[PDB]
Amino acid sequence: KSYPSCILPNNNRHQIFNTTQGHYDAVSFIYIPIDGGYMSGSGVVVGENEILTNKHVVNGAKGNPRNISVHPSAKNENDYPNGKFVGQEIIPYPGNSDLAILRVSPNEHNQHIGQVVKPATISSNTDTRINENITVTGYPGDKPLATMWESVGKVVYIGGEELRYDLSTVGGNSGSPVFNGKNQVIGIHYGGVCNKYNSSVYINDFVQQFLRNNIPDINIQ
Amino acid sequence: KSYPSCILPNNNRHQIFNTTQGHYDAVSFIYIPIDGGYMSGSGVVVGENEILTNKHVVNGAKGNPRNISVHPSAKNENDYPNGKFVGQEIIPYPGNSDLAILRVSPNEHNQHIGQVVKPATISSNTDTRINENITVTGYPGDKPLATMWESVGKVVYIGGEELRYDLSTVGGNSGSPVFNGKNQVIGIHYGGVCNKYNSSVYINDFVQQFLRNNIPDINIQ
């Protein structure tokens, strides 16, 4: 058992039904069979064949990326509007943050994940500040499996590779994109300190280089 | 489900039976009831009423330290030579590392945790280097519940608040002390990247200040 992230006083969450509309389509559901059961998590499409998520999420594959299923725009357990893409290569962030790139294979129709949905825009994070209104959108495990939920709140802390917020998340949210009001990705949710705050990997200048060094078509605004 | 840390090519582990001997007595087993079941982890006694462990371990208490049971020197499920101490106050590291101090209450005999075992010695980490021989000792969840195991290996990376090693650990090891050859604590295990390495919070100068600011009798050698 585990409890990676926290229900906070601010528990303002609603389900996304039109999961392929707008910036939602790159939000991705992750499913990994392990020990006869499954682990699930979240991620975000950022390139032709790439998502971002947590190191501790891809770890569930026990070193083999082909154990990971990525469903971009998952709507529920029996509604994957874009099907699945199978993990191909795990590229951990060399720094100390809980961040990994997962490269995925094209699907059975030779479609690439970044063709069926719009890859997310990465923020340059030059305007990102404390008390900014943000959302964290992904697949919390206290809801029905593979339903997408947006959680609303504010940035309470920015420092180094860490950005913290006052909004609620639940095991399953691991790897969820953090969006600013312009729907750009400022961070990748990884955890929290209960019940004080939840935490994300802040996409600072050094993280951005890692993205640039590995994802040629990354879109940093 | 989760898989926080990794079996690596180096899987050199043995069970500690004399758990109160020497530097082993401060190694601690953590038990947290959650969602009708339980979460378990590891930690290390470092002061009269204090252990170190991970932020993501204490999170299992959902904000209430009294949900946490700490058994220093636990030997097996029916052998707690020092009984249990109940969580009293959670003090997260303000920095970005997966590190928390858990203050515990005295036991039913008014004994303090740092009186029944010798608090561990914290290394100054001025000699700690890559390729140094180390151990990580705690309660891996693939062994019988609350049995103590020492894992042997080498440091492969030191940077910022992160120290990585080539030795194997398993879910349950979260919060385990990392010992150098002088049996001083150089880090606190928190995770890994499968199957490349496992990771700990490196007790650098800034972490040491946090320890000093909160634990008056901390012993930094």
Query: How long is chain B?
Result: 221
Give the Cα separation of A179 and A193 in Å (integer).
20
| Whether B127 and B65 share a structural domain | no
Interface of A with B (CB under 8 A): 1-7, 34-35, 37-39, 55-56, 58-63, 92, 95-98, 100, 159-162, 191-196
| DSSP β-ladder status, B185-193 and A27-34 | unpaired
Cα separations in angstroms, B205 against A101, A117, B99 = 31, 45, 14
List of residues 6+ apart from B183 with CB closer than 8 A: B22, B23, B121
Q: Which of A35, A56, A95 sits opposite B4 (nearest CB)?
A: A56
How distant is the alpha carbon of residue A139 from its chain centre?
A: 9
| Whether A10 and A34 share a structural domain | no
Cα separations in angstroms, A203 against A60, A179, A186 = 23, 11, 6
Which of A98, A176, A189, A200 does the annotation list as catalytic? A98
| Residue-range definition of the domain harbouring residue A81 | 20-120
Under 8 Å between Cβ of B195 and A60: no
| Whether A74 and A150 share a structural domain | no
We report the CATH number of the domain holding residue B135 as 2.40.10.10
List of residues 6+ apart from A92 with CB closer than 8 A: A55, A58, A99, A100, A101, B193, B196
Under 8 Å between Cβ of B125 and B204: yes
Under 8 Å between Cβ of B104 and B49: yes
Give the Cα separation of A141 and A4 in Å (integer).
11
| Whether A149 and A69 share a structural domain | no
The sign of the dihedral angle between the CA atoms of B213, B214, B217, B221 is negative
| Whether B6 and B98 share a structural domain | no
Q: Which of B79, B70, B198, B178 is nearest to B134 (CA)?
A: B178
Under 8 Å between Cβ of A140 and A150: no
- Contact between B62 and A6 using a beta-carbon 8 Å cutoff: yes
Q: Which of B103, B197, B65, B106 is nearest to A96 (CA)?
A: B197
Question: What resolution does the deposited structure have, in angstroms?
Answer: 2.1
Cα separations in angstroms, A40 against A52, A56, A137, A175, B77 = 14, 11, 15, 10, 30
| Whether B137 and B219 share a structural domain | yes
| Whether A128 and A164 share a structural domain | yes
- Active site annotation includes B23: no
Q: Which two tokens stand for residue A109?
A: 């129709």
| Whether B14 and B63 share a structural domain | no
Give the Cα separation of A109 and A96 in Å (integer).
37
Under 8 Å between Cβ of B57 and B119: no
Under 8 Å between Cβ of B210 and B203: no
How distant is the alpha carbon of residue A176 from its chain centre?
A: 3
φ, ψ of residue A12 to 5 degrees: the values are: -115, 90
Q: Which two tokens stand for residue A71?
A: 């469903």
Give the Cα separation of A173 and A195 in Å (integer).
16
- Active site annotation includes B71: no
**B155 to chain A, closest Cα gap in Å:** 15
Q: Please count the structural domains in chain B.
A: 2
Q: Left if phi > 0, otherwise alpha if psi is -120 to 50, otherwise beta: which for B63?
A: left
Give the Cα separation of B199 and B188 in Å (integer).
9
Give the Cα separation of B183 and B134 in Å (integer).
9
CA dihedral A145→A146→A150→A153, nearest 10 degrees, is 60
Q: Which two tokens stand for residue B71?
A: 């058994």
Question: Amino acid identity of B25?
Answer: D
Adjacent-strand bridge partners of A20:
none
Give the Cα separation of B111 and A215 in Å (integer).
57
- Contact between B56 and A2 using a beta-carbon 8 Å cutoff: yes
**Domain limit, last residue, from A91, A120, A149:** A120
Task: Encode B112-151: b = buried (16+ Cβ within 10 Å), e = exposed.
Answer: bbbebbbbbbbbebeebeeebebbbbbbbbeeeebbbbbb
Under 8 Å between Cβ of B51 and B90: no
Q: Which two tokens stand for residue A116?
A: 């069926």
Q: Whose structure tokens read 């593979």?
A: A146
Give the Cα separation of A122 and A142 in Å (integer).
28
- In chain A, residues with a C-beta closer than 8 Å to the C-beta of B61 are 194
**Domain limit, last residue, from A120, A142, A172:** A120
Cα separations in angstroms, A129 against A133, A159, A164, A174, A181 = 9, 10, 11, 22, 12
Give the Cα separation of A185 and A220 in Å (integer).
9
- In chain A, residues with a C-beta closer than 8 Å to the C-beta of B31 are none
Give the Cα separation of B72 and B49 in Å (integer).
12
Q: Would you tell me how many other CB atoms lie within 10 Å of the CB of residue B23?
A: 19
| Whether A135 and A58 share a structural domain | no
Q: Which two tokens stand for residue A158?
A: 């920015």
| Whether A204 and A163 share a structural domain | yes
> What is chain B written as a DSSP string?
----S---SB--EEEES-TTSGGGTTEEEEEEEETTEEEEEEEEEEETTEEEE-HHHHGGGTT-GGG-EEEET--BTTB-TT--EEEEEEEE-SSSSS-EEEEE---TTS--HHHHSPPPPBP--SS--TT-EEEEEE--TTSSTT-EEEEEEEEEEEETTEEEESB---TT-TTPEEE-TTS-EEEEEEEEETTTEEEEEE--HHHHHHHHHH-TT--B-
φ, ψ of residue B191 to 5 degrees: the values are: 175, -145
Q: Whose structure tokens read 């949900």?
A: B67
Three-class SS string for chain A? CCCCCCCCCECCEEEECCCCCHHHCCEEEEEEEECCEEEEEEEEEEECCEEEECHHHHHHHCCCHHHCEEEECCCECCECCCCCEEEEEEEECCCCCCCEEEEECCCCCCCCHHHHCCCCCECCCCCCCCCCEEEEEECCCCCCCCCEEEEEEEEEEEECCEEEECECCCCCCCCCEEECCCCCEEEEEEEEECCCEEEEEECCHHHHHHHHHHCCCCCEC
Query: How long is chain A?
Result: 221
| Whether A2 and A50 share a structural domain | no
Q: Which of B91, B133, B132, B83 is nearest to B110 (CA)?
A: B83
Interface of B with A (CB under 8 A): 1-7, 34-35, 37-39, 55-56, 58-63, 92, 95-98, 100, 159-162, 191-196
The sign of the dihedral angle between the CA atoms of A41, A44, A50, A55 is negative
Q: Whose structure tokens read 């040491």?
A: B208
- Active site annotation includes A2: no
Under 8 Å between Cβ of A66 and B8: no
**Domain limit, last residue, from B90, B120, B150:** B120
Q: Would you tell me how many other CB atoms lie within 10 Å of the CB of residue A104?
A: 27
| Whether A10 and A86 share a structural domain | no
